[PDB]
Scaffold this motif. Sequence first.
Motif, PDB file in Angstrom:
ATOM      1  N   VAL A   1       0.884  -1.024   0.078  1.00 18.48           N
ATOM      2  CA  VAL A   1       0.053   0.100   0.030  1.00 18.48           C
ATOM      3  C   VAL A   1       0.887   1.235   0.152  1.00 18.48           C
ATOM      4  CG1 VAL A   1      -1.560   1.325   1.459  1.00 18.48           C
ATOM      5  CG2 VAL A   1      -2.159  -1.163   1.014  1.00 18.48           C
ATOM      6  N   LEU A   2       0.495   2.180  -0.422  1.00 21.99           N
ATOM      7  CA  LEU A   2       1.040   3.603  -0.574  1.00 21.99           C
ATOM      8  C   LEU A   2       0.064   4.726   0.011  1.00 21.99           C
ATOM      9  CD1 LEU A   2       1.817   1.958  -3.116  1.00 21.99           C
ATOM     10  CD2 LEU A   2       3.535   3.618  -3.483  1.00 21.99           C
ATOM     11  N   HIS A   3       0.556   5.379   1.075  1.00 20.52           N
ATOM     12  CA  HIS A   3      -0.218   6.541   1.666  1.00 20.52           C
ATOM     13  C   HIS A   3       0.592   7.495   2.131  1.00 20.52           C
ATOM     14  CE1 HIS A   3       0.291   4.627   5.334  1.00 20.52           C
ATOM     15  NE2 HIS A   3      -0.126   5.451   6.083  1.00 20.52           N
ATOM     16  N   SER A   4       0.102   8.833   2.162  1.00 10.03           N
ATOM     17  CA  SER A   4       0.784  10.026   2.633  1.00 10.03           C
ATOM     18  C   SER A   4       0.400  10.517   3.952  1.00 10.03           C
ATOM     19  CB  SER A   4       0.874  10.824   1.542  1.00 10.03           C
ATOM     20  OG  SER A   4      -0.520  11.103   1.181  1.00 10.03           O
ATOM     21  N   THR A   5       1.326  11.179   4.585  1.00  9.07           N
ATOM     22  CA  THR A   5       1.021  11.698   5.880  1.00  9.07           C
ATOM     23  C   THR A   5       1.944  12.711   6.344  1.00  9.07           C
ATOM     24  OG1 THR A   5       2.556   9.996   6.964  1.00  9.07           O
ATOM     25  CG2 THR A   5       0.118   9.128   6.980  1.00  9.07           C
ATOM     26  N   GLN A   6       1.424  13.675   7.154  1.00 11.20           N
ATOM     27  CA  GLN A   6       2.219  14.765   7.595  1.00 11.20           C
ATOM     28  C   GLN A   6       2.836  14.531   8.877  1.00 11.20           C
ATOM     29  OE1 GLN A   6       4.502  17.279   8.413  1.00 11.20           O
ATOM     30  NE2 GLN A   6       3.779  18.188   6.575  1.00 11.20           N
ATOM     31  N   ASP A   7       3.865  14.919   9.088  1.00 12.73           N
ATOM     32  CA  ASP A   7       4.686  14.771  10.673  1.00 12.73           C
ATOM     33  C   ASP A   7       6.171  15.202  10.421  1.00 12.73           C
ATOM     34  OD1 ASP A   7       2.415  13.498  12.020  1.00 12.73           O
ATOM     35  OD2 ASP A   7       3.418  11.366  11.768  1.00 12.73           O
ATOM     36  N   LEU A   8       6.563  15.594  11.504  1.00 13.10           N
ATOM     37  CA  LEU A   8       7.963  16.320  11.667  1.00 13.10           C
ATOM     38  C   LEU A   8       9.038  15.350  11.043  1.00 13.10           C
ATOM     39  CD1 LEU A   8       8.222  19.180  12.482  1.00 13.10           C
ATOM     40  CD2 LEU A   8       9.584  18.011  14.144  1.00 13.10           C
TER      41      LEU A   8
ATOM     42  N   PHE B   1      -2.426  -3.490  15.715  1.00 13.07           N
ATOM     43  CA  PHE B   1      -3.543  -3.698  14.818  1.00 13.07           C
ATOM     44  C   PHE B   1      -3.211  -3.736  13.110  1.00 13.07           C
ATOM     45  CE2 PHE B   1      -6.696  -2.922  18.246  1.00 13.07           C
ATOM     46  CZ  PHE B   1      -6.282  -2.212  18.901  1.00 13.07           C
ATOM     47  N   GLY B   2      -3.844  -4.272  12.545  1.00 11.14           N
ATOM     48  CA  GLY B   2      -3.481  -4.072  10.766  1.00 11.14           C
ATOM     49  C   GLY B   2      -4.445  -3.693   9.948  1.00 11.14           C
ATOM     50  N   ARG B   3      -4.289  -2.617   9.171  1.00  4.91           N
ATOM     51  CA  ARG B   3      -5.339  -2.044   8.082  1.00  4.91           C
ATOM     52  C   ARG B   3      -4.973  -2.711   6.616  1.00  4.91           C
ATOM     53  NH1 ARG B   3      -8.745   2.212   9.892  1.00  4.91           N
ATOM     54  NH2 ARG B   3      -8.266   3.146  11.894  1.00  4.91           N
ATOM     55  N   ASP B   4      -5.941  -2.555   5.885  1.00  2.00           N
ATOM     56  CA  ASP B   4      -5.662  -2.777   4.506  1.00  2.00           C
ATOM     57  C   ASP B   4      -5.971  -1.414   3.542  1.00  2.00           C
ATOM     58  OD1 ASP B   4      -8.556  -2.684   4.778  1.00  2.00           O
ATOM     59  OD2 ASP B   4      -8.460  -4.230   3.038  1.00  2.00           O
ATOM     60  N   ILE B   5      -5.992  -1.684   2.030  1.00  2.00           N
ATOM     61  CA  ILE B   5      -6.154  -0.399   1.341  1.00  2.00           C
ATOM     62  C   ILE B   5      -7.470   0.202   1.554  1.00  2.00           C
ATOM     63  CG2 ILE B   5      -6.584  -2.038  -0.775  1.00  2.00           C
ATOM     64  CD1 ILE B   5      -4.993   0.483  -2.021  1.00  2.00           C
ATOM     65  N   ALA B   6      -8.193  -0.691   2.055  1.00  2.77           N
ATOM     66  CA  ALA B   6      -9.706  -0.138   2.602  1.00  2.77           C
ATOM     67  C   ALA B   6      -9.732   0.664   3.501  1.00  2.77           C
ATOM     68  CB  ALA B   6     -10.656  -1.457   2.885  1.00  2.77           C
ATOM     69  N   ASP B   7      -8.373   0.926   4.371  1.00  5.30           N
ATOM     70  CA  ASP B   7      -8.329   1.783   5.335  1.00  5.30           C
ATOM     71  C   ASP B   7      -9.290   1.510   6.661  1.00  5.30           C
ATOM     72  OD1 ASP B   7      -6.930   2.939   3.459  1.00  5.30           O
ATOM     73  OD2 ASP B   7      -7.772   4.726   3.139  1.00  5.30           O
ATOM     74  N   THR B   8      -9.196   0.241   6.892  1.00  8.90           N
ATOM     75  CA  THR B   8     -10.117  -0.443   7.895  1.00  8.90           C
ATOM     76  C   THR B   8      -9.394  -1.476   8.707  1.00  8.90           C
ATOM     77  OG1 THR B   8     -12.088  -0.086   6.601  1.00  8.90           O
ATOM     78  CG2 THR B   8     -12.043  -1.878   8.380  1.00  8.90           C
ATOM     79  N   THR B   9      -9.616  -1.758   9.992  1.00  8.20           N
ATOM     80  CA  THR B   9      -8.760  -2.648  10.821  1.00  8.20           C
ATOM     81  C   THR B   9      -9.405  -3.983  10.530  1.00  8.20           C
ATOM     82  OG1 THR B   9     -10.056  -2.181  12.511  1.00  8.20           O
ATOM     83  CG2 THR B   9      -8.234  -0.738  12.386  1.00  8.20           C
TER      84      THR B   9
END
Lengths: 49, 49
Positions: free
Chosen positions: A28-35, B7-15
């Motif tokens: 999976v690839l996703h983006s997030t903002q943090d220092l 916990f683990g999530r998938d591309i659905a963004d659900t645990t």
Amino acid sequence: TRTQLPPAYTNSFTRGVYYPDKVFRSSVLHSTQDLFLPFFSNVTWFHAI
Amino acid sequence: FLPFQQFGRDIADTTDAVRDPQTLEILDITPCSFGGVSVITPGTNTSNQ
Ligand SMILES: *[C@@H]1O[C@H](CO)[C@@H](O)[C@H](O)[C@H]1NC(C)=O
Ligand SMILES: *[C@@H]1O[C@H](CO)[C@@H](O)[C@H](O)[C@H]1NC(C)=O
């Protein structure tokens, strides 16, 4: 007898990356903002040679 | 999971996978109550089925 030399400056190279959650993610690839460390930035290089 | 994740999530963004905090065993999550009810009527004029 403490001799002091001007400090030098080195560059970052795609480092300073860590895990920001206990949530497992995979394929999976996703983006997030943090220092985070800015890539290819000048940081202070210290010595004790 | 990693030995710090819980916990683990998938591309659905659900645990969808949790870690047993008594055994350290990954256990999947699978919801239920799926779908609806459709009715096949041959006509009201004829026999009631
Ligand atoms: C870092 O700083 C030094 C001294 O100012 C300079 O020579 C060098 O080009 C700089 N490098 C970067 C990555 O900006
Ligand atoms: C039901 O069937 C009967 C016998 O064929 C017929 O007389 C009647 O008109 C029908 N009713 C309807 C609304 O289909």
